[PDB]
Amino acid sequence: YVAALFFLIPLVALGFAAANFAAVVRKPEGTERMKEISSYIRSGADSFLAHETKAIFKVAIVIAILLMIFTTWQTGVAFLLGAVMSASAGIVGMKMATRANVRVAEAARTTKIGPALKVAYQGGSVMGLSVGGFALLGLVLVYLIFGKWMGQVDNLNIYTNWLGINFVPFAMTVSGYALGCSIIAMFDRVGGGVYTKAADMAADLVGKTRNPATIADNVGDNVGDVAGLGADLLESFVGAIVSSIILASYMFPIYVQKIGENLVHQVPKETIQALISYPIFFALVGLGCSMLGILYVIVKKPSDNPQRELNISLWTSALLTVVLTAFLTYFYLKDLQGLDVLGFRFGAISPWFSAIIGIFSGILIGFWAEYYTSYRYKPTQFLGKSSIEGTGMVISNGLSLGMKSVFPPTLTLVLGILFADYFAGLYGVAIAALGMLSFVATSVSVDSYGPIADNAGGISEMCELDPEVRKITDHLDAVGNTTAAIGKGFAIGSAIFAALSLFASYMFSQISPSDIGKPPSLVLLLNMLDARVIAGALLGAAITYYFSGYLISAVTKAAMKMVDEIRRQAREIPGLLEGCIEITSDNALKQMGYPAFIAILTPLVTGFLLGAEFVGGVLIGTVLSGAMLAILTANSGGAWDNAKKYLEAGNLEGYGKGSEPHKALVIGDTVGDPLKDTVGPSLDILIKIMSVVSVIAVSIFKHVHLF
């Protein structure tokens, strides 16, 4: 076996990707104009992937060596597995996305809206199924090879390496895996995010110096919401599972009591081992459920409403997972012992209640993102309508909106944390994070749908293929845009929940051989009353604000550098001949190290200067600040965009376009775009990677710091 059965799920997911690829690839594209536009963007995507991958390779090697020297070789391998695993997923989804777009638009005419959705969604699913299969294939490998074969799940005492750096082997191994996933996420957001909006600015910046720099912007849409959103969600997914494993693993040395000079493990090996393996199996059942959710919607009789379709896959994947999960939990944790001490209030079933809380939190966090972002509800409506009072008002109201929009989703996270932890303690928080993300394949599938449609729509526009064809196309895109704001919203929620599990992980990972005496409560402690901790927290909040400010300026730097590649193309051409991607792609990368140094090196520097408490502080400031700003920037940016739309759909009598309010709404959307698509999504990654790195380096700086 029953267990191998589970362990081969990721393989079917991967083959399933391979099949959806096939079945889409065998779909056709129409006109030479339809093919030509696709290749523009498809080649455009490859160029960017090429340059980015090479940069990723260079950093991954250096990190791998470093891990191998300072921790253990297993950890460095695990790191590479994760880097290869997430890398692979992005590379596959993008290849799909940039080929499915043409075949959506042709679906919209050759077929005649439902069978165009059936195409788009099959495409979207290649990114989602690859995200699940790869991420879980990797963890299965690490569990099987380093955990079982090499016995890291059999020993799991506190190991001390050739430099006297001490850690629990498996905990450390999977921490490396997580770092691998993080680094490709970081590159995809802080690098690809700059590119994407650098393109959008540049395109949206014409004084007459179609088809000028549109293709860069069109690739951006895939870079951002296929690859970027996918890497983001992947990291949070692995982060949640890895954290469950790290807390479980360390529970072994924590729950020992000396009795007559024996060390008695109050939570025993069987329990720890099950608790380590459980989240993997939990996530596997999820993938199986998500495959059923995805396949169902593809094979299903078609609809006229693609939102309901996309949603049927989501709801289906989640109902399914809740049900099977409760059996998995009862049967898998039926007789373990020490679950009381472990934090399980209702014995065995406890963490399932936690997973469920996370699931519902995720969905609610989705609803809130829609609520604050969709004309259709009040906040955006109001924003939209205030346009008649001017650009200042539009800006001030949008800032006001997003600042307020932070409360409902956060209350939802607060209640989720409280309840998660009521059922199953800190382990329960991480399992809730995992439940929140348990149907990640389907979540990611609906995300990737957005750009496929967006390109499909634009391709219709560039080609000017009919109006009747264009109607289905605009609708598909319209739905992309809603599901995309829900998507960003859900991915910020999951980033916060994952980061908070990784913070629990950071503290658990500090247990030393010399603590095995002490009470759990003296070892599982970060005291906020400590000045180092207060300082840490302040430093981390400010670093997060800096990071965000820097990324805005980065986007505007790169855009402008492109305009000039345009300007030198248009100064070159019109004089003689009437009237890229790599350039801005290269500058996006160049202007990335700096953010990446902040993300990766901040724990290291502050850790080696001031130690584990201060870094504990830093991680807390970072998550608190980052959680809030991520939400503010998503919502403000979304609201501003959908407000512009609102008037464009003619919901303000007598204004509908190039009018003074429309202009004011355009200016808000231009301020908003870098916030929603670059700042917020980068912060998701910052609040995670900074934690993973810390989890690993606290091996060294608990003991070896300067002051």
Per the annotation, binding residues are: 197, 200, 204, 218, 221, 454, 641, 669, 673, 676
Taking the C-alpha atoms of residue 215 and residue 227, their distance in angstroms, rounded to an integer, is 17
Stretch that binds Mg ion, among 87-95, 187-195, 239-247, 446-454 (CB under 5 A): 446-454
Three-class secondary structure of residue 308 per DSSP: helix
- For 23, 97, 213, 392, the CA distances from 220, given in Å and listed in that order, are 25, 12, 11, 29
**Residue 218 or 585 with smaller CB distance to Mg ion:** 218
**DSSP class per residue in 580-625:** --HHHHHHHHHTTHHHHHHHHHHHHHHHHHH-HHHHHHHHHHHHHH
Interacting partner of 402 out of Ca ion, Mg ion, a copy of itself, none (Cβ under 5 to 8 A depending on kind): a copy of itself
Find residue 481's DSSP bridge partners: none
Scan residues 510-549 and list those touching Ca ion (CB under 5 A).
none
Interacting partner of 627 out of Ca ion, a copy of itself, Mg ion, none (Cβ under 5 to 8 A depending on kind): a copy of itself
Distance in Å, CB of 511 to a copy of itself, minimum: 12
Distance in Å, CB of 469 to Ca ion, minimum: 24
Distance in Å, CB of 201 to a copy of itself, minimum: 9
Binding residues for Mg(2+): 200, 204, 218, 221, 454
Find residue 167's DSSP bridge partners: 159
Q: Are 694 and 413 in contact (CB under 8 A)?
A: no
Binding residues for Ca(2+): 641, 669, 673
Distance in Å, CB of 218 to a copy of itself, minimum: 21
Residue 245 dihedral angles phi and psi, to the nearest 5°: -70, -45
Taking the C-alpha atoms of residue 173 and residue 661, their distance in angstroms, rounded to an integer, is 56
Scan residues 217-276 and list those touching Mg ion (CB under 5 A).
218, 221
Distance in Å, CB of 316 to a copy of itself, minimum: 31
Q: Which of 225, 641, 648, 684 binds Ca ion (CB under 5 A)?
A: 641
Interacting partner of 157 out of Ca ion, a copy of itself, Mg ion, none (Cβ under 5 to 8 A depending on kind): none
**Residue 363 or 524 with smaller CB distance to a copy of itself:** 524
- Rounding to the nearest 10 degrees, give the CA dihedral for residues 456, 461, 462, 467: 110
- Rounding to the nearest 10 degrees, give the CA dihedral for residues 638, 641, 642, 643: 120
Interacting partner of 221 out of Ca ion, Mg ion, a copy of itself, none (Cβ under 5 to 8 A depending on kind): Mg ion
Binding residues for substrate: 197, 676
**Residue 398 or 616 with smaller CB distance to Ca ion:** 398
Three-class secondary structure of residue 516 per DSSP: coil
- Residue 2 burial (10 A CB sphere; 0-12, 13-18, 19+): exposed
State the number of binding residues for Ca ion (CB under 5 A): 2
**Residue 109 or 676 with smaller CB distance to Ca ion:** 676
Residue 101 dihedral angles phi and psi, to the nearest 5°: -45, -60
Kindly give, in sequence order, each residue whose CB lies less than 8 Å from that of residue 602, ignoring residues fewer than 6 positions away: 540, 543, 618, 690
Taking the C-alpha atoms of residue 292 and residue 509, their distance in angstroms, rounded to an integer, is 37
Find residue 160's DSSP bridge partners: 166
**Residue 377 or 422 with smaller CB distance to Ca ion:** 377
Distance in Å, CB of 451 to Mg ion, minimum: 8
Scan residues 452-471 and list those touching Mg ion (CB under 5 A).
454, 458
**Residue 46 or 461 with smaller CB distance to Mg ion:** 461
State the number of binding residues for Mg ion (CB under 5 A): 4
Binding mask 654-673 for Ca ion (x = CB under 5 A): ---------------x----
The two three-digit tokens of residue 111, written as one number: 């077929």
- For 24, 140, 190, 592, the CA distances from 598, given in Å and listed in that order, are 41, 31, 11, 10
**Residue 221 or 447 with smaller CB distance to Mg ion:** 221
DSSP H or E segment with residue 340: helix 339-342
Distance in Å, CB of 207 to a copy of itself, minimum: 10
| Alpha-helical regions (H) of 387-439 | 391-405, 407-436
Residue 225 touches Ca ion, criterion: CB under 5 A: no
Binding mask 592-631 for Ca ion (x = CB under 5 A): ----------------------------------------
Q: Which residues bind Ca ion (CB under 5 A)?
A: 641, 669
Q: Which residues bind Mg ion (CB under 5 A)?
A: 218, 221, 454, 458
